[PDB]
Motif scaffolding. Structure first.
Motif, short mmCIF file in Angstrom:
data_model
loop_
_atom_site.label_atom_id
_atom_site.label_comp_id
_atom_site.label_asym_id
_atom_site.label_seq_id
_atom_site.Cartn_x
_atom_site.Cartn_y
_atom_site.Cartn_z
N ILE A 21 0.70 -1.12 0.09
CA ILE A 21 0.19 0.03 0.10
C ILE A 21 0.87 1.33 0.06
O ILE A 21 0.71 2.45 -0.54
CB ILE A 21 -0.95 -0.02 1.29
N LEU A 22 1.88 1.09 0.94
CA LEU A 22 2.96 2.23 0.85
C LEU A 22 4.02 2.27 -0.13
O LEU A 22 4.38 1.12 -0.51
CB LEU A 22 3.62 2.17 2.08
N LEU A 23 4.35 3.29 -0.63
CA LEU A 23 5.48 3.35 -1.99
C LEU A 23 6.74 2.72 -1.41
O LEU A 23 7.11 1.77 -1.83
CB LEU A 23 5.57 4.76 -1.90
N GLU A 24 7.00 3.04 -0.13
CA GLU A 24 8.21 2.52 0.49
C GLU A 24 8.14 0.77 0.38
O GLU A 24 9.21 0.22 0.15
CB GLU A 24 8.53 2.80 1.92
N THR A 25 7.22 0.07 0.80
CA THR A 25 7.10 -0.98 1.01
C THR A 25 7.36 -1.89 -0.56
O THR A 25 7.94 -2.84 -0.61
CB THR A 25 5.48 -1.49 1.27
N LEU B 181 -8.73 10.84 -16.22
CA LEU B 181 -7.74 11.05 -15.24
C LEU B 181 -8.09 10.15 -14.11
O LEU B 181 -9.11 10.33 -13.52
CB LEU B 181 -7.91 12.43 -15.03
N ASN B 182 -7.05 9.38 -13.73
CA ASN B 182 -6.96 8.72 -12.61
C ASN B 182 -5.90 9.17 -11.78
O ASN B 182 -4.68 9.04 -12.10
CB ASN B 182 -6.77 7.17 -12.92
N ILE B 183 -6.30 9.95 -10.62
CA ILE B 183 -5.13 10.52 -9.81
C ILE B 183 -5.17 9.84 -8.42
O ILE B 183 -6.05 9.78 -7.63
CB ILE B 183 -5.54 11.99 -9.43
N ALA B 184 -3.92 9.83 -8.02
CA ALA B 184 -3.65 9.26 -6.61
C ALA B 184 -2.55 10.19 -5.77
O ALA B 184 -1.81 10.45 -6.61
CB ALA B 184 -2.82 8.02 -6.76
N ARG B 185 -2.68 10.62 -4.76
CA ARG B 185 -1.95 11.52 -4.02
C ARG B 185 -1.54 10.71 -2.96
O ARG B 185 -2.21 9.94 -2.40
CB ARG B 185 -2.81 12.79 -3.65
N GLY B 186 -0.29 11.14 -2.49
CA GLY B 186 0.13 10.39 -1.25
C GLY B 186 -0.32 10.96 0.10
O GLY B 186 -0.38 12.08 0.25
N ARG B 187 -0.67 10.26 1.12
CA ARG B 187 -0.92 10.49 2.42
C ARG B 187 -0.15 10.08 3.22
O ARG B 187 0.38 9.03 3.52
CB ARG B 187 -2.50 10.01 2.78
N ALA B 188 0.77 11.30 3.95
CA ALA B 188 1.65 10.77 5.00
C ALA B 188 1.16 9.99 6.24
O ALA B 188 0.22 10.70 6.98
CB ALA B 188 2.52 12.34 5.41
N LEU B 189 1.56 8.95 6.38
CA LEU B 189 1.18 8.19 7.62
C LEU B 189 2.19 8.16 8.50
O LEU B 189 3.45 8.61 7.86
CB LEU B 189 0.47 6.70 7.39
N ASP B 190 2.16 7.34 9.51
CA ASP B 190 3.49 7.31 10.57
C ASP B 190 4.18 6.09 10.06
O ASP B 190 5.70 6.14 10.30
CB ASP B 190 3.02 6.91 12.00
N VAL C 42 -3.66 7.55 -2.19
CA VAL C 42 -5.13 7.66 -2.19
C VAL C 42 -5.73 8.13 -3.39
O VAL C 42 -5.20 9.08 -4.02
CB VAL C 42 -5.61 8.61 -0.90
N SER C 43 -6.46 7.48 -4.07
CA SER C 43 -7.23 7.70 -5.31
C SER C 43 -8.34 8.57 -5.20
O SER C 43 -9.10 8.78 -4.18
CB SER C 43 -7.55 6.36 -5.73
N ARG C 44 -8.56 9.06 -6.38
CA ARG C 44 -9.69 10.03 -6.48
C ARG C 44 -10.47 9.35 -7.66
O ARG C 44 -9.87 8.50 -8.35
CB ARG C 44 -9.18 11.57 -7.21
#
Lengths: 186, 186, 186, 186
Positions: free
Chosen positions: A135-139, D159-168, D174-176
């Motif tokens: 799910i994570l880019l890093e993975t 257009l299929n867009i995915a933006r990254g959500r900063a998690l810990d 995350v898709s639109r």
């Protein structure tokens, strides 16, 4: 196959994995009735369920007790789980108490991915398969790297799925977040 | 499952359908060993092969004789095709000579989609499933409309797949064209 | 904006970047008429052209002399290029001879990405923006890491674009390979 | 460009359009300072804001009074709106009271799409552009057909867009939901 809505969710527990992804995990896993599989990071239990009905033995793991709990519940509503060993706790440790495996699916790597993969290599029966869900880019990067460094021929497939939602005005496409599957040759 | 590269291609014949798509078509079809399926527009033979190995009888169709040919070939290299009736010609007509069906997959609708669907409704055994494969924008719309007008509860899922290609500098993601699957309730 | 087909291609030189991606690079860059930009890995020259017409000065770079050449050509057919300094050679080195920059776009990182980014950090005017174009999985990871390690607040957006191709039978959607844009806060 | 979060939302009012989509709408619109545009179905007001700052006159429409309201608000927080005529009500009727247009963007077609497009054709200044925003599968088909039947050379981009959500743990994509833009030649 079991659709996403026929699963019991828990807020602290992620999942179920999109049915379309689960579908593919099974294609890649090539489940056999005499196979022993381990589902690291079982979460809602989506993969475990599908594996449960196709292999001899399934070993399900998750640090999150809520996960272990949601999986047991979902195993029940569908009438499976006899051939399933639930193991709450730390993956590396739980992995050391398991027999050898024919199939290994790694979902919530809980950041100990590299260690988990090494261990899994050491228990992989000849002809075994490993499939990492990312799910994570890093993975996506780490998996590819590790498996390669462990001597496997690695592959990756990203899935972008949109399902139609019936509105009164029409059918709008709803996206799922992208999911990658890093897998080893069979 | 059989990967895209282990298929014999023919320029005039399109396909094989991406393995990821084939994978899902099977999930949706819910193949049973006593089921009778028809694969309209068999092309390279991808769907036919997968259905061949899971159902009682498969009836494969295609206007394109090169397709019928490529399917026979691919059936062989993989050792299947006994339970497969190949039928070269016009879909509507070939459909009328077939028994009833449990599963109907429609790929290359060859623009006679609406007629094909009606016919298929008329031979669909209770609990039967229809799955239309769409590449053209217009097919996505027509399928949804028709099936709805034929009284089915319709659904649609679009797949955007990217697989990694190993280069010397790294792994680049290579896209497949989007494929939609319009399907009826089970 | 200039469409992909109104660009002169060269086999050895990649590009032009999809117009939809170029469009967004401009949105993120927030081009101003008194800004100084550097386009590392200018290739076909797509980003350079767009930047050329909106900022004070543009510094275009590429190891590939064919690239430098195709960019100059493309600059001409569109009547731009006066405010553009073309620099053939190794990016790190050509970067050291440049003034400070308000905007930095890095495309073909040519594997010296980490070095390039450091250098760029050191010449970034306050309020400067960095945007990295990624095609390889590894670049997506490396860019994010680097920029984060250089103390920037990093973001990433992946674009999956499909454009319709008019066929006699209908409109089919043709995919572009996924492109990521890793960019720093403004 | 203004990001999605710097917009004021209202539950009954959809939007704002993803910034990446808005970004492209502008590319296609080719806004000029002496142009007159109409934004049918302004919603949260995203397109209107962007057009507001680049053209002479903008005519914003929406059946939904909440929309007209949210747009005015959003116009204010950003200090624009003097060149904007807000029109609450039924599109076809409101369209008849407007001068000719250089640019026409149709968002929430409110199912009167075909009528709206005919009218817009009738007021389109030579060299004018039409851009239809589509969320529903049916709209994608209808727009294409209509514009084609109205004699335009039509195009479509999804257009299929995915933006990254900063998690810990890391960055998740995350898709639109997919958005299609059906547009006429310039």
């Amino acid at each position: 196959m079991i659709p996403d809505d026929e699963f019991i969710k828990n807020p602290s527990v992620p999942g179920p994995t999109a049915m379309e992804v689960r579908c593919l995990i099974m294609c890649l896993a090539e489940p056999g009735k005499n196979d022993v599989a381990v589902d690291v990071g079982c979460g809602t239990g989506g993969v475990t369920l599908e594996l449960a009905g196709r292999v001899r033995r399934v070993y399900a793991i998750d640090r999150n007790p809520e996960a272990i709990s949601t999986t047991e519940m979902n195993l029940q509503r569908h009438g499976l789980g006899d051939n399933v060993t639930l193991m709450e706790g730390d993956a590396p440790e739980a992995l050391c108490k398991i027999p050898d495996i024919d199939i290994a699916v790694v979902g919530g790597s809980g950041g100990e991915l590299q260690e988990i993969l090494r261990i899994i290599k050491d228990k992989l029966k000849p002809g075994g398969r490993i499939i990492v869900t990312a799910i994570l880019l890093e993975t996506k990067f780490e998996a590819m790297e590790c498996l390669r460094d462990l001597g496997f021929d690695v592959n990756i497939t990203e899935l972008n799925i949109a399902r139609g939602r019936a509105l009164d005005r029409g059918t709008m496409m709803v996206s799922r977040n992208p999911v990658a599957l890093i897998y080893t040759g069979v």
